[PDB]
């Protein structure tokens, strides 16, 4: 499931929490969208939900990486983002 976002002055416009040690869902060490920022790209184009598992960003694997390591990959984006999401896979999917 992929979501193209246009990165801008508010970033991508969401907040993530997940990664090695920051696992949002017990048993699922993936990056999870924990908040979505007002007027953010992911709030407008994003069609994204709080609780979404990020597989990758610009198809760079976010699967079991350190939170800061992942966030840096989403941060190093400019005016375009290809967000790769899956719903909670190793846990209760929704």
């Amino acid at each position: 499931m992929e979501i193209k976002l246009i990165k801008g002055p508010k970033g991508l416009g969401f907040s993530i929490a997940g990664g090695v040690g920051n696992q949002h869902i017990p048993g699922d060490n993936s990056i999870y969208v924990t908040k979505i920022i007002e007027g953010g790209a992911a709030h407008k184009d994003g069609k994204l939900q709080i609780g979404d598992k990020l597989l990758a960003v610009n198809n760079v694997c976010l699967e079991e990486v350190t939170h800061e390591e992942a966030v840096t990959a989403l941060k190093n984006t400019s005016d375009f983002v290809y967000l790769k999401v899956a719903k909670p896979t190793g846990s209760h999917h929704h």
Partner: peptide
């Protein structure tokens, strides 16, 4: 160590 575990962060 800017972004961290046990906390969410805006991208």
């Amino acid at each position: 160590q800017r972004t961290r575990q046990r906390n969410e962060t805006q991208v």
